[PDB]
């Protein structure tokens, strides 16, 4: 009733009043029901994702929006079982899955036994290895061997594809070892676009050093995964009203990991943004508001990156600001605002990102809540907007990091536990939501979206004055 009036939903203090976490939770329950009917997940290239798309689309159509379901090619990747790695020559040694070695995400499967050949290594503290980054590194590389490659400088995908082009049967990339914190296993990917055709694993630095100095070494490596070329979808809609040349865009990825329902990650952002879009159907914005639900974020930001890269330059220039909402209901939440001004972590977003951050900061302060910065190093769907020079910001309640004592004093909850203990897990379901955090973060999403829908001047002022290790969850280099 009252929240159908343009006088409420058009303005920054009216829209949050109308956007209730309890109503967002009803949408989260629908996503939970979808997961339960579709093998327990809403992952890219699954019926659970398709049913999520259908729900978002129908909801938007019922609220009066035209909806664009935008397909894009997508190579799905699924680990089927643990990997194996053993030395056969000069002496039999069994290496330990998830201790000595792990998979590169998006690797091909394989079962390979071959001589191990090091490629352009530069060992030791402080090294600036470029191992495997240039085709010349593989001059005189014997086809059929396993390439032993050191992390450094360029993307894992480039190292592995260069090895494949030299006829390698498999690739072992070991951590760089230039600092003490770069010697263990890490979450690493060859990218959804990997086309090397051969298996690729990651190993600890010390294992790489020792293997590189073992004469006659042969390793037997088994990678048990499946890749499948298919497609997935973004869902895009925009208000009929508002300046089409000054678009305020909001996004939230709609896919989960395969491991679970993805209710906090990222049902929370998807559902809050959907409630906001439904409310904004009755608003009278000055600037057009565009809403995107991204596919395949968990595979390396594939949907959001595809959307931005495929916009005609004229269309890209019309997007003035991008706001990203990825995980905003964490049970053990902190109040995190993207650090667009680099005040905390030294990485600055494109001009206008500071103004967006300041809007979120001021809103949290007005509500009597504390907040703090979080990193913007290409961890979610703003990445390609950032890369394209578009001002951006966003909100986050925390994932696998452990809450600090100071944060427990500011936000409550439990110090020493993850902000979200069900991150990327089967338990990321309907119970894995803090409704107080969801309420405040949805309120702030609504306030800043509505503010910018009336005036982008704070962003425009910074644009006028002005004159990559990860890509999503995994490290690309
Ligand atoms: Na080289
Ligand atoms: Na692709
Ligand atoms: Na990952
Ligand atoms: Zn997410
Ligand atoms: Zn995630
Ligand atoms: Zn900051
Ligand atoms: Zn509220």
Author numbering: 44 to 510, 527 to 536
Sentences from the study reporting this entry:
Here we investigated the aminopeptidase, P. aeruginosa aminopeptidase (PaAP) from P. aeruginosa, which is highly abundant in the biofilm matrix. PaAP is associated with biofilm development and contributes to nutrient recycling.
The structure of full-length PaAP was solved to 1.4 Å, and traceable between residues 44 to 536 with a 16 amino acid region (QKAQSRSLQMQKSASQ) near the C-terminus, which lacked density. This short propeptide region is structured, folding with a hairpin turn. The carboxy terminus interacts with the side chain of R194. Side chains of H532 and D533 of the β-hairpin coordinate a water molecule and are positioned directly above the active site pocket. The location of the C-terminus appears to block access to the active site residues.
